[PDB]
PDB file of C-alpha atoms in Angstrom:
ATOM      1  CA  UNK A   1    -205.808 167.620  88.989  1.00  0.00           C
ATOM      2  CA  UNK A   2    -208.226 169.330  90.949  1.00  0.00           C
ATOM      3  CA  UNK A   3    -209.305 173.407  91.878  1.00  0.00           C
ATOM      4  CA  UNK A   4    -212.394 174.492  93.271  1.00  0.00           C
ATOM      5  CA  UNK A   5    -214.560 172.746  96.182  1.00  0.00           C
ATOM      6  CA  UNK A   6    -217.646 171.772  96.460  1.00  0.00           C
ATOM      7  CA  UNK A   7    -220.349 172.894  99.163  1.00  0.00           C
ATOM      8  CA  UNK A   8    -220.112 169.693 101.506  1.00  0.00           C
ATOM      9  CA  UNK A   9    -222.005 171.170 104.280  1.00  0.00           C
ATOM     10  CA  UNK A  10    -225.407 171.944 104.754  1.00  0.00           C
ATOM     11  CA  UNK A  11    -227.484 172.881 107.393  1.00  0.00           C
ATOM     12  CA  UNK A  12    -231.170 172.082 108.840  1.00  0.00           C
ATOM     13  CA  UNK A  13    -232.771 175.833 107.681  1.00  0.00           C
ATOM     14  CA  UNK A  14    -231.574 175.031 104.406  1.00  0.00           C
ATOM     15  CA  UNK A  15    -233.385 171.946 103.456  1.00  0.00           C
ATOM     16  CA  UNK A  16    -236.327 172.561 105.456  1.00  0.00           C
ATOM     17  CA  UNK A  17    -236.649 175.559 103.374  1.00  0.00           C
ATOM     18  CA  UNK A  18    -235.714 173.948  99.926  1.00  0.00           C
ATOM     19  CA  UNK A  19    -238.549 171.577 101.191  1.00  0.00           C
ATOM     20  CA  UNK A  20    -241.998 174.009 101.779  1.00  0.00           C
ATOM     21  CA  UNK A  21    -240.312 175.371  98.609  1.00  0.00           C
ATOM     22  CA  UNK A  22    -240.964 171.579  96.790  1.00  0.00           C
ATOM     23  CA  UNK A  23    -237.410 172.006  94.809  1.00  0.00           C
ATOM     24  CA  UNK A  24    -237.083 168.189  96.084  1.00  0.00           C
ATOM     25  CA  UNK A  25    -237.097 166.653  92.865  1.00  0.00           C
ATOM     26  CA  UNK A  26    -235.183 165.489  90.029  1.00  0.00           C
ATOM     27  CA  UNK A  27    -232.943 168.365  91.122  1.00  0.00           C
ATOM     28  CA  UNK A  28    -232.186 168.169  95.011  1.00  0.00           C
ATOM     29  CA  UNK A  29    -232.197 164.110  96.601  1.00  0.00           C
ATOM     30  CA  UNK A  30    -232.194 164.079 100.070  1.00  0.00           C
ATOM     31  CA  UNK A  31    -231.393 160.318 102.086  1.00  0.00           C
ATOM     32  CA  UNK A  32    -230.911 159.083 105.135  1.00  0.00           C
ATOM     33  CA  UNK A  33    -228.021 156.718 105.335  1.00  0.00           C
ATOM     34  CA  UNK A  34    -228.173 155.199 108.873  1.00  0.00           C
ATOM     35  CA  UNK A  35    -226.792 152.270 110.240  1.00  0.00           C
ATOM     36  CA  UNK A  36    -226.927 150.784 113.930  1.00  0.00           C
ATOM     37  CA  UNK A  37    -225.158 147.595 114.977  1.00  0.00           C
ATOM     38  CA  UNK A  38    -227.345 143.773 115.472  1.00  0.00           C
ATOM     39  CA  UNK A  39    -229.851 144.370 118.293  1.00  0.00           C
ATOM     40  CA  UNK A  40    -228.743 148.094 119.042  1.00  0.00           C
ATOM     41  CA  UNK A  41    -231.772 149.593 116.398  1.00  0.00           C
ATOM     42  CA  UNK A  42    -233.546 149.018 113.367  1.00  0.00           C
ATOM     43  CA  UNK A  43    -233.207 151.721 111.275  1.00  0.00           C
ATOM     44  CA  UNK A  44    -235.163 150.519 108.114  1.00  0.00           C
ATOM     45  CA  UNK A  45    -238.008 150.425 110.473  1.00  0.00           C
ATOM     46  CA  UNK A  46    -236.846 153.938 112.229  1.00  0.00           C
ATOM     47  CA  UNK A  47    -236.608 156.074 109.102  1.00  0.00           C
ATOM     48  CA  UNK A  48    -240.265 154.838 107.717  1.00  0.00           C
ATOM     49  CA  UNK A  49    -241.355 155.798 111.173  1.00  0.00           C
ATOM     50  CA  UNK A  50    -239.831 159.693 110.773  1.00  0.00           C
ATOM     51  CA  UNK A  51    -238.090 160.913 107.818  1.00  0.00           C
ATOM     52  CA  UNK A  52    -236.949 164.686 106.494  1.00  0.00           C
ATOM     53  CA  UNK A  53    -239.896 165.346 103.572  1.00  0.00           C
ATOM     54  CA  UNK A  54    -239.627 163.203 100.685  1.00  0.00           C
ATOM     55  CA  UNK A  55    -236.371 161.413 101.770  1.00  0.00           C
ATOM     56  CA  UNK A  56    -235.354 157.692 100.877  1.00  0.00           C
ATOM     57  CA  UNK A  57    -233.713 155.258 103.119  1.00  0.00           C
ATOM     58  CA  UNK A  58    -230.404 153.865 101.596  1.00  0.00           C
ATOM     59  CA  UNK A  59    -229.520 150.179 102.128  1.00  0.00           C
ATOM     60  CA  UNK A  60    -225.860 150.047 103.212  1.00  0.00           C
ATOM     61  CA  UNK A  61    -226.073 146.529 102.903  1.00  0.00           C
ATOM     62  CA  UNK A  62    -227.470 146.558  99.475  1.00  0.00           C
ATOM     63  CA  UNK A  63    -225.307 149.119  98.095  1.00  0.00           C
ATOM     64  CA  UNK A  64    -222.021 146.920  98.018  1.00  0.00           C
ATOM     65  CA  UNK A  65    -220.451 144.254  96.421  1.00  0.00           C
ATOM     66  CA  UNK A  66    -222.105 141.876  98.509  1.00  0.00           C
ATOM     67  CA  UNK A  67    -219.701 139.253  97.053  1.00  0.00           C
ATOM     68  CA  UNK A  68    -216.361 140.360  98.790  1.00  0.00           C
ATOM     69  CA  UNK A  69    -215.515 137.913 101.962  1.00  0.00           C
ATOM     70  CA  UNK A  70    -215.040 141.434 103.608  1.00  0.00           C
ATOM     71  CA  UNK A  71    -217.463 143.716 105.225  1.00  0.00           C
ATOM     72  CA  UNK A  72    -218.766 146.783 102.900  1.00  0.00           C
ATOM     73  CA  UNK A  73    -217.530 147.408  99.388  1.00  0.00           C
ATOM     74  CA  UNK A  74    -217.789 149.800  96.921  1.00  0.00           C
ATOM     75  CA  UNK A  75    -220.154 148.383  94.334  1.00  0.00           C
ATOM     76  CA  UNK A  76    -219.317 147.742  90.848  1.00  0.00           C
ATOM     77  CA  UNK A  77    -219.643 150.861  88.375  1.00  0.00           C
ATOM     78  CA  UNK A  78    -222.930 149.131  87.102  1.00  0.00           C
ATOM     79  CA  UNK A  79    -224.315 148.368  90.179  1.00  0.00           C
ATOM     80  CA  UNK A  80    -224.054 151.841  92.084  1.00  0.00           C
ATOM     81  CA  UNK A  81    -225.497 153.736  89.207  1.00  0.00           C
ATOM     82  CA  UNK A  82    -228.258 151.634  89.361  1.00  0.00           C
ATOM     83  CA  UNK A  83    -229.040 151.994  92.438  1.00  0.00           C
ATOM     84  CA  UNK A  84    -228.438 155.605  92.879  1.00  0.00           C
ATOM     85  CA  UNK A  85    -230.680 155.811  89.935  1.00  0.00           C
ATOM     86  CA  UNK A  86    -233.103 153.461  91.065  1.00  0.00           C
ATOM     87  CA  UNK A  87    -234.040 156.383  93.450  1.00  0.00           C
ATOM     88  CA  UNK A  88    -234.305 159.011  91.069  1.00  0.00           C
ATOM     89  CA  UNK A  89    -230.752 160.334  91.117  1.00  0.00           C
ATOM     90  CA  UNK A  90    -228.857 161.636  87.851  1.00  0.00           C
ATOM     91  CA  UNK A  91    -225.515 162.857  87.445  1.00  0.00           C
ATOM     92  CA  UNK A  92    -226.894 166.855  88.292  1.00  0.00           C
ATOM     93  CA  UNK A  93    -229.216 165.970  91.423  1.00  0.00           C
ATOM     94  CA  UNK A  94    -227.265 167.095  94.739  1.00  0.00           C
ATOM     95  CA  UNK A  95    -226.839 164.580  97.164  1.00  0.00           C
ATOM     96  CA  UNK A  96    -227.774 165.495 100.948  1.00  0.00           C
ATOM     97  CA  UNK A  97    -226.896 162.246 102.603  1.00  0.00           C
ATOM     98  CA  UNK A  98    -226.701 161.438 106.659  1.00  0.00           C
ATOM     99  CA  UNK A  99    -227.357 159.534 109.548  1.00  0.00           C
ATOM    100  CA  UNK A 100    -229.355 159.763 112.289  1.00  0.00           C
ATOM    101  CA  UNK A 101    -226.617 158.536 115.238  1.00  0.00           C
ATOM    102  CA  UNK A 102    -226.699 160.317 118.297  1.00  0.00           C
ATOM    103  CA  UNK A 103    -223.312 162.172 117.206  1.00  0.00           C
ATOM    104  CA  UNK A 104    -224.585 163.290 114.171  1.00  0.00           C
ATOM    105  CA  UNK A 105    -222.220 161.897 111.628  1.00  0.00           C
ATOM    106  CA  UNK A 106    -220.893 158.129 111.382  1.00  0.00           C
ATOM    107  CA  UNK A 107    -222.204 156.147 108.371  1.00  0.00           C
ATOM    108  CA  UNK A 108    -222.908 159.872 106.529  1.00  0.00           C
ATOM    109  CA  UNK A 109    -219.503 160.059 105.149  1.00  0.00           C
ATOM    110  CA  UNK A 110    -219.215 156.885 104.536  1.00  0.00           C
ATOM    111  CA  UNK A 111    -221.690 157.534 101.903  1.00  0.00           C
ATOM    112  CA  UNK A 112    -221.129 160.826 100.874  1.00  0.00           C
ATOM    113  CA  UNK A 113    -217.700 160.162 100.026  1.00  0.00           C
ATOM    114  CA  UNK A 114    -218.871 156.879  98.400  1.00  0.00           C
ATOM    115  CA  UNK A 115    -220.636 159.516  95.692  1.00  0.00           C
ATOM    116  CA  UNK A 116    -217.321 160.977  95.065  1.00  0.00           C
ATOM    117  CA  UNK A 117    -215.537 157.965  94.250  1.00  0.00           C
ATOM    118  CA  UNK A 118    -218.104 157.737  91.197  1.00  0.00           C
ATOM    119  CA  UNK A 119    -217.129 160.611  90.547  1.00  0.00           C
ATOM    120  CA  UNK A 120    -219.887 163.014  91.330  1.00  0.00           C
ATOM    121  CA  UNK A 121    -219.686 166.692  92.341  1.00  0.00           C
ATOM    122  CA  UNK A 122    -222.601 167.678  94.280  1.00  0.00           C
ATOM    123  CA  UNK A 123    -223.148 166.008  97.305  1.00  0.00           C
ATOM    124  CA  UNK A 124    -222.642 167.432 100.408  1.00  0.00           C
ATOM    125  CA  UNK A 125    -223.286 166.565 104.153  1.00  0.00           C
ATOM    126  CA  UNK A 126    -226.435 167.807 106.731  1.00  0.00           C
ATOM    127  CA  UNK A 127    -224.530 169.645 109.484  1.00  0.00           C
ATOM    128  CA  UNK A 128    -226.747 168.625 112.412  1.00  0.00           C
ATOM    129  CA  UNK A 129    -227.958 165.430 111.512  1.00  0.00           C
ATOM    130  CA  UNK A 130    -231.638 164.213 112.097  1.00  0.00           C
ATOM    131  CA  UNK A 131    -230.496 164.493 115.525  1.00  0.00           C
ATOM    132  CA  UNK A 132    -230.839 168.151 115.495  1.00  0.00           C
ATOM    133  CA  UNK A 133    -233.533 168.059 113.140  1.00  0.00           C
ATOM    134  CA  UNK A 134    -236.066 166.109 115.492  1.00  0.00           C
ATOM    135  CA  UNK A 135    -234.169 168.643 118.028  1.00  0.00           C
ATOM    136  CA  UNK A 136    -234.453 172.119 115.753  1.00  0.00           C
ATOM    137  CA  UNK A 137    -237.643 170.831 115.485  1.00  0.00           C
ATOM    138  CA  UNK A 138    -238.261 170.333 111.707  1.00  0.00           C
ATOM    139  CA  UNK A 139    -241.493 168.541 109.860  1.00  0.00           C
ATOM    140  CA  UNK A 140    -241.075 164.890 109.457  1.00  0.00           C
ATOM    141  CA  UNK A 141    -243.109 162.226 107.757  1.00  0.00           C
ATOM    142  CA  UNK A 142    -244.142 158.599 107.567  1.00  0.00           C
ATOM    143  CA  UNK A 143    -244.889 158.752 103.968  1.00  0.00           C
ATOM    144  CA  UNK A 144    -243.522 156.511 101.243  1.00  0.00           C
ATOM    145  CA  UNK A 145    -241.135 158.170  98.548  1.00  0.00           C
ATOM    146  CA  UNK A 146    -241.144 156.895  95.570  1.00  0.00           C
ATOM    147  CA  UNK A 147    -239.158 158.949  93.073  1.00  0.00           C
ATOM    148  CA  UNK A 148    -239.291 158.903  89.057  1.00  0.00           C
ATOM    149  CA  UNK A 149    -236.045 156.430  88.642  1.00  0.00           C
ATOM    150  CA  UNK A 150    -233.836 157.946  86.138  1.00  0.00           C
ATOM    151  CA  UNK A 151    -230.286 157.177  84.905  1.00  0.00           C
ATOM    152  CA  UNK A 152    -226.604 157.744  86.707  1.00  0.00           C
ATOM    153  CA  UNK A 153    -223.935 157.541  84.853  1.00  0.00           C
ATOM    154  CA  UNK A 154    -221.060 156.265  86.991  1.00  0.00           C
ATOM    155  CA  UNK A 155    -217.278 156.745  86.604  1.00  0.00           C
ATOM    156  CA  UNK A 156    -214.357 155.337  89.313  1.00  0.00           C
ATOM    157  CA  UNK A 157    -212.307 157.514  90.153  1.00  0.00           C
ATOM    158  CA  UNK A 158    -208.573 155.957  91.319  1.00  0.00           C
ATOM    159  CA  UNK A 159    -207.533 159.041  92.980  1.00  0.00           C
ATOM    160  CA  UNK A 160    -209.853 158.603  96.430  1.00  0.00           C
ATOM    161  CA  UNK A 161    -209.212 155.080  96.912  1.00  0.00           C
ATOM    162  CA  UNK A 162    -205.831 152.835  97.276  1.00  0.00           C
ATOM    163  CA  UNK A 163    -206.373 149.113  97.665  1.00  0.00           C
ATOM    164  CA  UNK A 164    -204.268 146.929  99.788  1.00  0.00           C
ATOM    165  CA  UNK A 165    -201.324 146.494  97.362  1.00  0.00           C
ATOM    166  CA  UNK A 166    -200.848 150.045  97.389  1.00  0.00           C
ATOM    167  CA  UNK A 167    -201.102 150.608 101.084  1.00  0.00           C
ATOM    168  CA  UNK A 168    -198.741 147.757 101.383  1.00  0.00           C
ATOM    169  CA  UNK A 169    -196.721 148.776  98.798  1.00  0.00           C
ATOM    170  CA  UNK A 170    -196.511 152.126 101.026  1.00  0.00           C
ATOM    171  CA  UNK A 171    -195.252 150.173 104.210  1.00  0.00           C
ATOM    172  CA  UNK A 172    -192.011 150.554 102.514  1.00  0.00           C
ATOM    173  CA  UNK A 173    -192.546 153.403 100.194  1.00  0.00           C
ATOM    174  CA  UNK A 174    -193.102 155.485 103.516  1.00  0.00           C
ATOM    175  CA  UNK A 175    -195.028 158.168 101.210  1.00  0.00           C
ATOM    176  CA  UNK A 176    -198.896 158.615 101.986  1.00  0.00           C
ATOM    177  CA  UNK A 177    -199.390 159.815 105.115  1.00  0.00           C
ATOM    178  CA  UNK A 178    -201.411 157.205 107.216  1.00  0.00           C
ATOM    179  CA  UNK A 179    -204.611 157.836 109.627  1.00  0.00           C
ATOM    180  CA  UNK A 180    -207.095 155.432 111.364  1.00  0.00           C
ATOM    181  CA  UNK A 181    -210.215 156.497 112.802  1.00  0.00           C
ATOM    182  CA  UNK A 182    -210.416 153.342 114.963  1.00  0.00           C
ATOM    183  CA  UNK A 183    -210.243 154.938 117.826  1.00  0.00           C
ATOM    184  CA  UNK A 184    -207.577 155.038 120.018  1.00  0.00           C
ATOM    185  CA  UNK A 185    -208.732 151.588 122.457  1.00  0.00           C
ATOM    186  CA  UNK A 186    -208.985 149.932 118.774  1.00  0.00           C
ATOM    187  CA  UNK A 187    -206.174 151.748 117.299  1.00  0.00           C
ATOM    188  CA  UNK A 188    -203.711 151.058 120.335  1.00  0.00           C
ATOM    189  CA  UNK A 189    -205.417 147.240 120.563  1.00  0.00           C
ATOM    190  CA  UNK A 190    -206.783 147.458 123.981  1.00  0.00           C
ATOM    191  CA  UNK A 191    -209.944 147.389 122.997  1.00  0.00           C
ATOM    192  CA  UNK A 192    -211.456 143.943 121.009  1.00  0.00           C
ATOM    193  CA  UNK A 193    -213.700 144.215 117.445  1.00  0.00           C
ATOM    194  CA  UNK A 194    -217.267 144.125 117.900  1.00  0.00           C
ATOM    195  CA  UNK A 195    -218.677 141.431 115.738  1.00  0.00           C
ATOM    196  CA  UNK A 196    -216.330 139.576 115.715  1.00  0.00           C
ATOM    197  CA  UNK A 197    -214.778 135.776 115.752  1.00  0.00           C
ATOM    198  CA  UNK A 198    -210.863 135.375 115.878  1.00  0.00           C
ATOM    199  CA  UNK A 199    -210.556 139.145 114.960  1.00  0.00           C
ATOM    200  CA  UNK A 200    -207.952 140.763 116.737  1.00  0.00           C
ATOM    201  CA  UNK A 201    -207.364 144.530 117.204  1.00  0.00           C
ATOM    202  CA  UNK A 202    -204.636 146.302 116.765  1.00  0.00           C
ATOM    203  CA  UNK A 203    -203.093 148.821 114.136  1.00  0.00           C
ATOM    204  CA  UNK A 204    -200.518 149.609 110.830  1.00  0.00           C
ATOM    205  CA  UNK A 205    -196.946 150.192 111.921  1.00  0.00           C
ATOM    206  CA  UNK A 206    -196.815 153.895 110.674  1.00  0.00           C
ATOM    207  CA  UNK A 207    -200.806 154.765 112.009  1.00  0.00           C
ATOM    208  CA  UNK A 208    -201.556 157.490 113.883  1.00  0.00           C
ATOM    209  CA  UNK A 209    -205.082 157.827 115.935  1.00  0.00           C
ATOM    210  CA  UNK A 210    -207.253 160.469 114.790  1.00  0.00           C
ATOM    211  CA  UNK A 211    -210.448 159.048 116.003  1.00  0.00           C
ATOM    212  CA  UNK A 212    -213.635 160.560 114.470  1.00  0.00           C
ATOM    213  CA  UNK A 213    -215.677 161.378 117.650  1.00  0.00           C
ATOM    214  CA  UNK A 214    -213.077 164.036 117.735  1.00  0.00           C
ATOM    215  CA  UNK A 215    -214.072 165.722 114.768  1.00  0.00           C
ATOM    216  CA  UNK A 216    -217.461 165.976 116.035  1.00  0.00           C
ATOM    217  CA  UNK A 217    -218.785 168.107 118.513  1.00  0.00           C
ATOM    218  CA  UNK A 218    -221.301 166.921 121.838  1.00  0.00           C
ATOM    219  CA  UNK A 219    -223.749 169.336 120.370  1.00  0.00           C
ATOM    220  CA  UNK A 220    -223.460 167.095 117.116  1.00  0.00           C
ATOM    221  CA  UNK A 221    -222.155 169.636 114.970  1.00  0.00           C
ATOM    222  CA  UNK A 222    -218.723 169.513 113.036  1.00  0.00           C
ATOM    223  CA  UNK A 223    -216.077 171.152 114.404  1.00  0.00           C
ATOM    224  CA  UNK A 224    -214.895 174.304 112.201  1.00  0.00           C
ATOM    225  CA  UNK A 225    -212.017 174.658 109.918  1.00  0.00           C
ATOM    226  CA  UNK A 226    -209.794 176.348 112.200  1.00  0.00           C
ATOM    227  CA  UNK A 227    -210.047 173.081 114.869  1.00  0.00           C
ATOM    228  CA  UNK A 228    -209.835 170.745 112.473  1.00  0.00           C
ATOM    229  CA  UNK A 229    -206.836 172.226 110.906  1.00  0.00           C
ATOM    230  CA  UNK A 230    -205.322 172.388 114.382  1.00  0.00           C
ATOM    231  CA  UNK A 231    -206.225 168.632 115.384  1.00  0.00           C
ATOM    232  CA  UNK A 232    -204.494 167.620 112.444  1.00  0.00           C
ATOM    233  CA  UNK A 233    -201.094 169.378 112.489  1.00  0.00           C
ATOM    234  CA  UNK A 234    -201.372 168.671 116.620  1.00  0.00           C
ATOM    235  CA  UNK A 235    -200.596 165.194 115.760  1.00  0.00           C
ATOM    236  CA  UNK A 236    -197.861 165.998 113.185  1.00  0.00           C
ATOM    237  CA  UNK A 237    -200.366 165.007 109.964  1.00  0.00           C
ATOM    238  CA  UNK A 238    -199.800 167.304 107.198  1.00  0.00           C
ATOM    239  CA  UNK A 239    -202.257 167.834 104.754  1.00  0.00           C
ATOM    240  CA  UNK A 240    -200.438 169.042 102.399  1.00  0.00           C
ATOM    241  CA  UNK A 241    -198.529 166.155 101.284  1.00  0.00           C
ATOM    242  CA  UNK A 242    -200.461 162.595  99.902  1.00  0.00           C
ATOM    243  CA  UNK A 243    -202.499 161.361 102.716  1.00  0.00           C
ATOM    244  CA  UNK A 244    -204.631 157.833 103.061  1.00  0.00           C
ATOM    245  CA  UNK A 245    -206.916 156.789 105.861  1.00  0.00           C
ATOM    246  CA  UNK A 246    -207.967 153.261 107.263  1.00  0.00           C
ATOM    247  CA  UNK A 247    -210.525 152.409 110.344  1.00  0.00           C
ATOM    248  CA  UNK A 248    -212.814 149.331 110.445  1.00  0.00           C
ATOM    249  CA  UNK A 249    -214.682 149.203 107.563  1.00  0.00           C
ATOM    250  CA  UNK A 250    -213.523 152.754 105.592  1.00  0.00           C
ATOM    251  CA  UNK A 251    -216.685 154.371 106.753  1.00  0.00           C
ATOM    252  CA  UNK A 252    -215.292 156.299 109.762  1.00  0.00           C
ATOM    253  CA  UNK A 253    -212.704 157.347 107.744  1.00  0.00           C
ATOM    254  CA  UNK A 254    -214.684 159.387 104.862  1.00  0.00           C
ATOM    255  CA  UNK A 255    -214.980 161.568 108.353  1.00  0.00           C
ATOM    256  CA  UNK A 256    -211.266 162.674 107.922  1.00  0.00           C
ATOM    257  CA  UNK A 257    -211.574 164.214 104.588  1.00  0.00           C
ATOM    258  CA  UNK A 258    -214.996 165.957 105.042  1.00  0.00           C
ATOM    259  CA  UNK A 259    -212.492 166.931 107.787  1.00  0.00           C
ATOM    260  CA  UNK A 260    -209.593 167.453 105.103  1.00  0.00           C
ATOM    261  CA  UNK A 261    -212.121 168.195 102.492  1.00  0.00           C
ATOM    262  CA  UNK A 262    -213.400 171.330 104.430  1.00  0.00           C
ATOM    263  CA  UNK A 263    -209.422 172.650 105.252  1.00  0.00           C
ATOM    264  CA  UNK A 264    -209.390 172.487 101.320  1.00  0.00           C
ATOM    265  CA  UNK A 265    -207.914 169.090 100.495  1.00  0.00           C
ATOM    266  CA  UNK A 266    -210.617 166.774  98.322  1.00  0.00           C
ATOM    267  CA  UNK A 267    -207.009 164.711  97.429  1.00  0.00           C
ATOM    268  CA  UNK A 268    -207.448 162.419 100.505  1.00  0.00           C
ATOM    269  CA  UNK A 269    -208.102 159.103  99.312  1.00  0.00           C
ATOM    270  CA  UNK A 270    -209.404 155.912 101.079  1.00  0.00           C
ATOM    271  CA  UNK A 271    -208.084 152.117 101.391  1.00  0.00           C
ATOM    272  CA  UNK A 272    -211.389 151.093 101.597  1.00  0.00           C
ATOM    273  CA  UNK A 273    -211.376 147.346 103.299  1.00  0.00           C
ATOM    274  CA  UNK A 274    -209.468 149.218 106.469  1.00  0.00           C
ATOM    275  CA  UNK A 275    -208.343 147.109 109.122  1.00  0.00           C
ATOM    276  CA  UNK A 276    -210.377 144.142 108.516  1.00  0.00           C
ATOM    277  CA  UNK A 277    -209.002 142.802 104.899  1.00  0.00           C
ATOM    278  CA  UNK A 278    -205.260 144.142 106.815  1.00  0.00           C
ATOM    279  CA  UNK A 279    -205.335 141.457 109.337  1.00  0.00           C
ATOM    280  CA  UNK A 280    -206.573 139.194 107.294  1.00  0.00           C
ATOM    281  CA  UNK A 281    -205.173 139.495 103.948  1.00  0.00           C
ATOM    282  CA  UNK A 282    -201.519 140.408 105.437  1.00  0.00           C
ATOM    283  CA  UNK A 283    -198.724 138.737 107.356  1.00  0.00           C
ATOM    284  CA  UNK A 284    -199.271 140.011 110.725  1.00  0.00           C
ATOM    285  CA  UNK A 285    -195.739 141.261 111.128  1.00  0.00           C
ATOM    286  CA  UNK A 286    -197.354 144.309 109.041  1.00  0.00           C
ATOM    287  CA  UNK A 287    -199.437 145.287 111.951  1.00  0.00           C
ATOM    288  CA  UNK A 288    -199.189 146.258 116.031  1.00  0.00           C
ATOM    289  CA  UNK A 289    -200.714 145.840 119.502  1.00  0.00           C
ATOM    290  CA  UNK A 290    -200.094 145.156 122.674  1.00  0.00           C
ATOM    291  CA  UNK A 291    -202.765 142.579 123.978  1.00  0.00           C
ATOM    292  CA  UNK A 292    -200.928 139.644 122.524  1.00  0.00           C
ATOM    293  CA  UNK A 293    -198.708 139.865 119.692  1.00  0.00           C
TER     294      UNK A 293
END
């Protein structure tokens, strides 16, 4: 049972003036949650380069159950809250989260959403990204942060995610509306998994290709609530009914309920594991290509 939204955009003005103002503090948290593929870039060594005022890096890899055979979990209650506390981050701090990817968004939502799960209210998305920033032109520094840890208190929430006896237990249901950020080359299985040894790509018998580039403009901006509201019905995906979304590793995804989120649906959960725990944890009659199969 849910009512009334949360801000989950903000922009670069916004920020930057929240910044010269110094309300960054056991208040506001700003972080920069970036991640590049092997060899592409390092951004641990990017963001201690150039980083928004009193930001923090946060450690995709380090922020999961790095125990799963599987490729980026949601940590354990205990282990989040420590972490999101071990930056100075309580249960009443917003949480201004992003990435600094040439689009704008990518890994961002896979985070921001992350904060929801644990059930958290404020936290909302930079419209813009560092892209813009660096491009509006903002301050920047290569100065250590290093916040006055304090205590989150962390609660799971069932509601945004469905594991893979629930999505399989869907198959056949025929219930939760199904979407896959993939992309359409990955989706449709033309295209093969980065990263990858005996992986094959391909999709869910029931998914439907609503690839996240989409939802972004070229300008690196989010598209507005009318588009995205348009997009969605365009492919026959209602929002008003249950929905669930799957990709690579459920980061992509997060993108379709900022996306849902913003036409005024928070209810979209996430099967977190996405295509990879799929193919490997189910018979492969379960799931389609073309290349093969």
């Amino acid at each position: 049972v849910h009512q009334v939204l949360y801000r989950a955009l903000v922009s670069t003005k916004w920020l930057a003036e929240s910044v010269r103002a110094g309300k960054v503090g056991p208040g506001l948290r700003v972080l920069d949650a970036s991640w590049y593929s092997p060899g592409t870039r390092e951004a641990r060594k990017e963001y201690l380069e150039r980083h928004v005022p009193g930001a923090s890096f946060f450690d995709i890899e380090e922020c999961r159950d790095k125990a799963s055979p599987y490729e980026v979990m949601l940590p354990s209650e205990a282990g989040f809250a420590d972490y999101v506390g071990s930056l100075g981050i309580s249960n009443d701090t917003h949480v201004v989260v992003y990435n600094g990817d040439d689009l704008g968004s990518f890994y961002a939502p896979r985070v921001w959403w992350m904060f929801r799960v644990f059930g958290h209210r404020t936290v909302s998305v930079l419209n813009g990204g560092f892209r813009n920033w660096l491009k509006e032109g903002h301050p920047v520094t290569s100065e250590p942060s290093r916040p006055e840890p304090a205590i989150f208190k962390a609660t799971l929430n069932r509601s945004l995610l469905k594991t893979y006896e629930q999505v399989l237990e869907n198959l056949e249901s025929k219930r939760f509306q199904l979407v896959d950020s993939r992309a359409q080359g990955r989706y449709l299985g033309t295209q093969p998994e980065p990263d990858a040894v005996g992986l094959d790509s391909g999709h869910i018998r029931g998914s439907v290709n609503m690839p996240f580039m989409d939802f972004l403009t070229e300008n690196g901006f989010e598209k507005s609530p009318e588009e995205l509201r348009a997009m969605f019905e365009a492919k026959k995906v209602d929002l008003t009914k249950p929905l669930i979304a799957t990709c690579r590793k459920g980061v992509t995804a997060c993108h379709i309920a900022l996306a849902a989120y913003l036409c005024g649906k928070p209810d979209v959960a996430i099967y977190d594991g996405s295509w990879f725990e799929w193919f490997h944890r189910a018979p492969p009659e379960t799931w389609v290509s073309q290349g093969k199969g």
